[PDB]
From a paper:
Alzheimer’s disease is the most common form of dementia and is neuropathologically defined by the presence of extracellular plaques containing Aβ in the brain parenchyma and intraneuronal neurofibrillary tangles containing phosphorylated tau. Peptides between 37 and 43 residues in length are generated, with those of 40 (Aβ40) and 42 (Aβ42) residues in length being the most abundant. These Aβ monomers tend to aggregate into insoluble fibrils, the structure of which has been extensively studied in vitro by cryogenic-electron microscopy (cryo-EM) and solid-state nuclear magnetic resonance spectroscopy, revealing a spectrum of different polymorphs. Two human fibril polymorphs have been determined: ‘type I filaments’, which are mostly associated with sporadic Alzheimer’s disease (SAD), and ‘type II filaments’, which are observed in familial Alzheimer’s disease (FAD) and other neurodegenerative disorders with amyloid brain pathology. Here, we determined the structures of nine ex vivo Aβ fibrils from six different mouse models by cryogenic-electron microscopy.
For the [name]/PS1 mice, we observed only one fibril type made of two identical LS-shaped protofilaments related by a C2 symmetry. This fibril type, which we call the murine type III Aβ fold, was also found in [name] mouse brain and accounts for 4% of all reconstructed [name] fibrils. Murine type III fibrils were determined to a resolution of 3.5 Å and 3.3 Å for [name]/PS1 and [name] mice, respectively. The reconstructed density of [name] murine type III shows only weak carboxy-terminal density; accordingly, an atomic model was built from residues G9–V40. The amino-terminal L-turn involves residues Y10–F19 and is mainly stabilized by one hydrophobic cluster composed of Y10, V12, L17, F10, L34 and V36. The S-turn, which involves residues F20–V40/A42, is stabilized by two hydrophobic clusters: in the first half of the S-turn between F20 and K28 involving A21, V24 and I31, and the C-terminal second half of the S-turn involving A30, I32, M35, V40 (and A42). The protofilament interface involving residues D23–K28 of murine type III fibrils is stabilized by symmetric salt bridges between D23 and K28 of the opposing subunits. The main chain trace of murine type III fibrils resembles one protofilament A–B pair of human Arctic Aβ-filaments. Although murine type III Aβ fibrils extracted from [name]/PS1 and [name] mice show some similarities to the human Arctic Aβ filament, their fold has not yet been observed in the brains of patients with Alzheimer’s disease.
Residue numbers in the entry:
A (entry chain C), B (entry chain A), C (entry chain E), D (entry chain G), E (entry chain I), F (entry chain B), ...: 10 to 40
């Protein structure tokens, strides 16, 4: 898994109640 | 998995209750 | 898992009650 | 797990009561 | 787990009562 | 407005984020 | 507004973040 | 506003962050 | 505003951070 | 505002940080 040179902007203003995953970036795995 | 040079903008203003996944970027895996 | 040169900005202004994961960046694993 | 050269900014202004994980960055593991 | 050259800024202004984990950075482990 | 002898049962198990009104009973008015 | 003899049961188990009104009973008014 | 003989049961088990009104009973007014 | 003979039971087990009103009973007014 | 003969039970077990009003009973006014 070669992952590089990633300019990332993430906005999540108002979240009532997250019942799961909020991932800005995932290179791998299990969710 | 060669992943590079990614300019990403993500907006999620109001989220009541997320019952799953909110992924800005996923190079691989299981969700 | 080769992960490098990542300029990341993450905003989560108001969160009532998170019942899961809020990950700015995950290189791997289980969530 | 080779993880380097990561310029990261994380904002979480108001959080009522977090019932899970708020991770700025995770190189691996279980959550 | 090779983790280096990480410039990290973390903000958590007001937190009512955290019932979990608030991690600025996790190189590994169990949470 | 004569309203009487009302046996009422109301269930609302999981509500993500209510953006309006959840009224078990309204005898009148404006909503 | 004559309102009487009202046996009422109200359940709201899990609410992420209410952005409005949750009224078990309203005899009148403005909401 | 004649309001009487009201046997009321109200349950609100888990509330992340209420951004409005949770009223068991309102005889009148403005909300 | 005639309000009488009100047997009321109110439960609010866990509340992360209330950003509004939690009223067991309101005979009138402004909220 | 005639308010009488009110048998009231109120439970609020765990409250992280209340940012508003928790009123068992309000006969009137401004909140």
């Amino acid at each position: 898994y070669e992952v590089h040179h990633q300019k990332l902007v993430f906005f999540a203003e108002d979240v009532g109640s997250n019942k799961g995953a909020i991932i800005g970036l995932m290179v791998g795995g299990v969710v």
